[PDB]
Design a protein around this ligand. Structure first.
Ligand code: G3B
Length: 341
């Protein structure tokens, strides 16, 4: 009700703060960082989330520094940011009301399967945001279904939560206990710290596969139990596999559970061939997010007529930028279909 008025710097553009007014603040989430609110900007009527972190006062916020570099339609945009209170950094973000987690669980609670057309849309917009994120050498490191925001009506997916993303410095090592356990790549559990952006892709597989199965593919009861779960679907990792993951542990030996069966009968051939492609031991083996997009599974989305179950056209899926294409520029004719040139 009470309209709060702050002095806020636009997320992008020149550092020139404006008076921004918002009201109807309610809490919609919280964690170690702090709290997320939903508010209504008084002047555009538009809804926003406000992530209230806690700023090390005498330290530069990594998330803030990362959000500013970022403008992509499948990523929650940092519209503004301000400070308040000792001292809290506030990120004013796009609000989107649903998450893949919550959608995936409604289906699962009702023992149905999320329509493959939604799996496609959502996974594609996910590989997109990462192709973009990774082109800057920024690893998300918490790719999990509740960091995927969805618009029920328009089928837009926006990646959110960069509260543990990092500009990866090759030659520079990092922390290995990151990601949500179920979505955490094997090398991470192995103690690797020399890792790459492939870890995000493993998380995507973990998602892809959970959308298909209606439950987490690898559900460990702890950091270490996690690898036991991966193991029972892929088997054990071998020389160049463990090599590739990290240059200790103590587990048991198990056989390679065939893919085209880890799921259910009606599951599409390409989706299965996707995961097998993602969910891979060696990290150089996992496909690239851009390269992922390319792969068949998403072909239906390259069909000129495709529409949303509710008869609307698909959200804008081909508005690529060269910044977005940077990684692998020679592959547009198979990512941009004619009808969008
Ligand atoms: C953590 C964290 N970092 N960003 C967010 C964030 C940002 C923008 C956002 O817009 C809507 C949400 C959102 C908040 C709560 C929910 S609940 C679990 O259904 C769903 C969606 C949101 C969350 O959360």
């Amino acid at each position: 009700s009470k309209v709060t008025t702050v002095v806020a710097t636009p997320g992008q553009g020149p550092d020139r703060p404006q008076e921004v007014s918002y009201t109807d603040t309610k809490v919609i989430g919280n964690g170690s960082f702090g709290v997320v609110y939903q508010a209504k900007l008084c002047d555009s009527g538009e809804l926003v989330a406000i992530k209230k972190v806690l700023q090390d006062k005498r330290f530069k916020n990594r998330e803030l520094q990362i959000m500013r570099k970022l403008d992509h339609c499948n990523i929650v945009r940092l519209r503004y940011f301000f400070y308040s209170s000792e001292v809290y950094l506030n990120l004013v973000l796009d609000y989107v009301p649903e998450t893949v987690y919550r959608v995936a669980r409604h289906y699962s609670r009702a023992k149905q399967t999320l329509p493959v057309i939604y799996v496609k849309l959502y996974m594609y917009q996910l590989f997109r945001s990462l192709a973009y994120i990774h082109s800057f050498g920024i690893c998300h490191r918490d790719i999990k279904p509740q960091n995927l925001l969805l618009d029920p009506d328009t089928a837009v997916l926006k990646l959110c939560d960069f509260g543990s993303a990092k500009q990866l410095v090759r030659g520079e090592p990092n922390v290995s206990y990151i990601c949500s356990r179920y979505y955490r790549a094997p090398e991470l559990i192995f103690g690797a710290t020399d890792y790459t952006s492939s870890i995000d892709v493993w998380s995507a597989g973990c998602v892809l596969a959970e959308l298909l199965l209606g439950q987490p593919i690898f559900p460990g009861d702890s950091g270490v139990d996690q690898l036991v779960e991966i193991i029972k679907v892929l088997g054990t990792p071998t020389r160049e596999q463990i090599r590739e993951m990290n240059p200790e542990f103590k587990f048991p030996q198990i056989k390679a559970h065939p893919w085209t069966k880890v799921f259910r009968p009606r599951t599409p051939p390409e989706a299965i061939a996707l995961c097998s492609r993602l969910l891979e031991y060696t990290p150089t083996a996992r496909l690239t997010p851009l390269e992922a997009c390319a792969h068949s599974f998403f072909d239906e989305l390259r069909d000129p007529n495709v529409k949303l179950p509710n008869g609307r056209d698909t959200p804008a899926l081909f508005n690529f930028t060269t910044q977005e294409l940077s990684s692998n520029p020679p592959l547009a004719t198979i990512l941009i279909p004619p009808h969008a040139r």
